[PDB]
Write a protein that binds this ligand. Structure first.
Ligand code: CL
Ligand code: CL
Ligand code: CL
Lengths: 92, 91
């Protein structure tokens, strides 16, 4: 529990991690821009720190999609947590 | 919601701790909540307690002339159950 996951904001987690699980269940590889758009985080919050914190925390990894276009892939830990956060969303 | 503005670590420590006391029928003082949860006294007393109250996740009550406690609301209770499962992923 030094997990940097603990340092993340609940809203950012409950937004981004379920969004990426739902794209994955559909077979779709979304761009950083589509991830922001579907999740509802601000692009300024995303590109000015959040993305790199999710990477640091072992929750996602960034990959090249095509020229000039990157995606995030869930790690097994990020996917395990994403599923737990889906139920949190129901409650809320 | 104010719930979304909370830090995941503080949530994952406090609300599960309270739920586990409640299942055992135990009514902890504020100091016992701090110690069992692993948050510091300063973190708890300098904003976190009151953030959890403002998010509707807990209610503060005077338990006796001696001590206070926090009770889970039903929202707080449902979210605690989900955060336990989250804790099985981390550990
Ligand atoms: Cl964050
Ligand atoms: Cl907090
Ligand atoms: Cl309690």
């Amino acid at each position: 529990m030094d997990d940097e996951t603990l340092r993340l904001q609940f809203g950012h987690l409950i937004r981004i991690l379920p969004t990426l699980l739902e794209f994955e269940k559909k077979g779709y590889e979304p761009s950083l821009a589509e991830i922001v758009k579907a999740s509802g985080v601000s692009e300024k919050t995303f590109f000015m720190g959040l993305k790199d914190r999710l990477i640091r925390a072992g929750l996602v990894k960034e990959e090249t999609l095509s020229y000039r276009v990157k995606t995030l892939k869930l790690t097994e830990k990020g996917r395990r947590l994403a599923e737990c956060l889906e139920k949190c969303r129901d409650v809320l």
